[PDB]
Design a protein around this nucleic acid. Structure first.
Lengths: 51, 57, 146, 171, 183
RNA sequence: GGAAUACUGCCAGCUGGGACUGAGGACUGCGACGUAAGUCAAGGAUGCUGGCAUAAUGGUUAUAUGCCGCCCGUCUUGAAA
RNA sequence: AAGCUCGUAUCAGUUUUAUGAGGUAAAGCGAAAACUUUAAAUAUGUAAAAUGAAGAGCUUUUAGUGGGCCAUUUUUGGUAAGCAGAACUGGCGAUGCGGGAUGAACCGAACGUAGAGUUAAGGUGCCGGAAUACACGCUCAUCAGACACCACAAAAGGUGUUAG
RNA sequence: GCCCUGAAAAUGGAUGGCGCUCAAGCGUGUUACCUAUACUCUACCGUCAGGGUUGGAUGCCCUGACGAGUAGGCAGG
């Protein structure tokens, strides 16, 4: 009889998506990524900083 | 069905029509492909010898 | 709001016959129920026939009935006419048969009974063959009305 | 808008028996990358008849100012169109970044020559390393030793409708 | 994708990104004084009222259609968050020619089960990855009835190109901000 | 050489204030929390409290104030006069 | 409107694919622009992938209708200048509502009765709802300007001012 | 580029008026704000449509979408 927004109503959210619980519990919205130390090539740096 | 154009492109200064040659060829080709099937059924730009070049007005 | 089709467009199918015959309305009610609760196309055909006008329900002759029964495998089927069965003096021999119709003229009824059959109404037809089993529903010639 | 500088590198559309196209690069001042790409296609076609379908943008980067808080004299070469023919202009702009200087130039063009962003083409922006190489006096004026000037007639902002004293314009 | 860009930088190559396959289009103008060919293309894209949006798969044919309807639409490349919010809040299924809200996974399973779509997130996956059953899933989705943007259009006059300070045309990744304002 | 910050984006992160609405009417559904019992914000508002019980609310009417509103019908021509 | 038929029907004021068209001169590269092979598509046809569509085809029937005005685009012929003849497509007619102070053809948007929110076009000194906002420049008119303008007076004149 | 001249008569009058001059003018940029019978959401009325109904059926229940109008057409009062 009444449409409820899953983006506001947490019960409807869980009803439509059982994975919302795991997402919230493990904080997949704030996943800290693994680091890399790759550096751009000197030709790339010169082209970026050239006219 | 034929072509009309003085030596402006009327379909239906004349030559024979070729407006269904592709359709006929595709009909025959799809028949042959069906017989064949029934019998047995982001690029990358690198810079080694090219560099970006500053060419502006 | 930029409509691609007509708004408030009526479908076109029928619900009430223009006739105010109470018995015809009762038959229509019975066959509306039957075509709803039964997935037999015969009941839908009979229901649709129950709405046609007089000019669209031409009579069916006993000669036409007998010729229809002359088909092989169709001798023991019950013939259904949603309309009037008229007599025909051009036939001198009539088979034994069971006919369901809205109306029988006196001559046609006498001929069927004398040949040894029975004349039943469409509600008796509904009781006997609820899905219209072993039926042969006939329509009379039309272009005769010009 | 608030301008950014983008390096844009494009090339011809690769085809069969056609390797290694001419990598055309440009520096575009624009509010965002969509406008920068459109401007790049426009300038590419003007330079040479290369349609958007006949080309492909292989790179676009944002170039930040290297020393963003150092005051720099910039010489800017531009050309712009009008009802008359295209004109070439040289201007001197004293600012801390190329994007700031380019925004100043666009506003000055709109105010003086009634020109617009679609009419101005920025040929070159370059820092003038030596003081002596400047030409325009409205820039050379701010380059003197121990520069000092007052700000006469200070007009203070009032929040309320009525003030209960006459205002002073002192500074 | 991120690591491929970094590898191209490190090797000195230029990582040319994959061509976009999905576009979200919103009808921007009203239903008065539209020329017949553009209004025919709008009806074919199911954009029959202002602030109505649909997903479109990108091919040559759809590209030419978008070129035709350019003055009357704002379109761009939708992100996963935008698609997810659109489907969750304003997703309606066309079921027996009726507009039915997507309030449960059973509604989606009963009608798209033939294609292997079992839930709202499977439908979103089929949209974001323009998949084998994209036509069926996209047509199952009822055209999105968006409101006017909360915060306005950000321009004084909408009916210029986005490039020239207007609203219409291809705005690429800015469609996400616009559509989230309109959601 | 090591950071920080800006900007852009994401969170099925948290939390405060305001406004309009409360359709439906035994139960049935999909879920959430619980070892269970069961409870819940999960197929649409309930709980607690006060004043009044009449011109108090409201209706009608006359006026005032703010904004709006050209005199009807016919007949002509695209159209208006 | 009524019948008959069917509805994995039948299509489409749309795109694409293959087949044509002013070959007009920018292909590039040829036997010394005179050659004669190609190419993104402005702009129509035929026939077969995209997108959309629950109504379609046929046969009998019934009413009202039988002028045009304005504009865009292309085209042919013209004048001092206006322009005239065609074809297409829109607007208006039968049409209320927001805006342009006002209004046949301008800009938005088409309409059941209400509530809340957001907007279009247009605006935000006061009339008058909304910044006498912020920022960079220009201008001082002895009747400035606040516009119809990629129009007429308009070809120029000036010891006004600014930037080139 | 802006400014002055670049001709114009005759009742008193018009950027709509007031008035405005680092504008309340002109060019341009960035925001905020105002409000249509338009858009979103809800309630209600009607029309149409699709499902269900053997236990006022010209009804009853569930659901969805729509609502400008002259001549004219059809229906209910």
């Amino acid at each position: 009889v009444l449409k409820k927004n899953p983006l506001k109503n947490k019960q409807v959210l869980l009803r439509l998506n059982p994975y919302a619980k795991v997402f919230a519990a493990e904080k997949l919205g704030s996943k800290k990524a693994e680091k890399t130390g790759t550096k751009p090539a000197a030709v790339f740096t010169e082209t970026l900083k050239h006219d | 069905i034929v072509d009309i154009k003085a030596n402006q492109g009327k379909t239906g200064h004349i030559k024979h029509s070729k407006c269904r040659q592709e359709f006929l060829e595709r009909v025959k080709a799809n028949a042959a492909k069906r017989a064949e099937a029934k019998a047995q059924g982001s690029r990358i730009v690198s810079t080694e010898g090219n560099v970006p070049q500053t060419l502006a007005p | 709001i930029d409509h691609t089709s007509k708004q408030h467009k009526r479908s076109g199918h029928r619900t009430a016959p223009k006739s105010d015959n109470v018995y015809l309305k009762l038959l229509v009610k019975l066959y509306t129920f039957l075509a709803r609760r039964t997935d037999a196309p015969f009941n839908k055909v009979v229901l649709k026939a129950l709405f046609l006008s007089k000019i669209n329900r031409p009579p069916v002759s006993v000669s036409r009935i007998a010729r229809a029964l002359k088909q092989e495998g169709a001798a023991n089927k019950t013939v259904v006419v949603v309309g009037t069965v008229t007599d025909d003096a051009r036939i001198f021999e009539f088979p034994k048969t069971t006919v369901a119709a809205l109306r029988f003229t006196a001559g046609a009824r006498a001929k069927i009974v004398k040949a040894g059959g029975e004349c039943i109404t469409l509600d008796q037809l509904a009781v006997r063959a609820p899905k219209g089993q072993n039926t042969l529903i006939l329509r009379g010639p039309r272009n005769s009305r010009e | 808008a608030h301008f950014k500088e983008y390096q844009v590198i494009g090339r011809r559309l690769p085809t069969e028996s056609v390797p290694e196209p001419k990598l055309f690069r440009m520096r575009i001042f624009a509010s965002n990358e969509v406008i920068a790409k459109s401007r790049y296609w426009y300038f590419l076609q003007k330079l040479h008849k290369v349609k958007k379908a006949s080309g492909e943008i292989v790179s676009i980067n944002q170039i930040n100012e290297a020393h963003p808080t150092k005051v720099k004299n910039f010489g800017v070469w531009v050309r712009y169109d009008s009802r008359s023919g295209t004109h070439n202009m040289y201007k001197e702009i004293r600012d801390v970044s190329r994007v700031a200087a380019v925004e100043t130039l666009y506003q000055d063009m709109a105010a003086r020559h009634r020109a617009r962003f679609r009419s101005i083409h920025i040929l070159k922006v370059a820092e003038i390393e030596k003081t002596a190489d400047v030409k325009r006096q409205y820039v050379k004026q701010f380059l003197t030793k121990d520069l000092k000037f007052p700000l006469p007639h200070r007009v203070q902002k009032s929040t309320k409708t009525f003030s209960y004293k006459r205002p002073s314009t002192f500074y | 994708i991120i690591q491929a860009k970094r590898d191209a930088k490190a090797a000195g190559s230029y990582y040319v990104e994959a061509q976009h396959k999905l576009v979200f289009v919103v009808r921007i103008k009203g239903i008065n004084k539209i020329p017949p060919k553009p209004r025919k293309v709008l009806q074919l894209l199911r954009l029959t009222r202002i602030n109505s949006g649909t997903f479109v798969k990108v091919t040559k044919a759809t590209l030419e259609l978008l070129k035709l309807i350019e003055p009357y639409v704002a379109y761009g490349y939708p992100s996963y968050s935008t698609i997810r919010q659109l489907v969750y809040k304003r997703g309606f299924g066309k079921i027996n020619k009726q507009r039915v809200p997507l309030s449960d996974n059973a509604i989606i399973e009963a009608n798209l089960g033939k294609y292997g779509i079992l839930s709202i997130d499977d439908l979103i996956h089929e949209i974001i990855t323009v998949g084998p059953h994209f036509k069926q899933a996209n047509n199952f989705l009822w055209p999105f009835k968006l409101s006017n943007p909360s915060g306005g259009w950000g321009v004084p006059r909408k009916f210029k190109h986005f490039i020239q300070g207007g609203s219409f045309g291809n705005r690429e990744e800015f469609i996400n901000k616009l559509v989230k304002s309109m959601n």
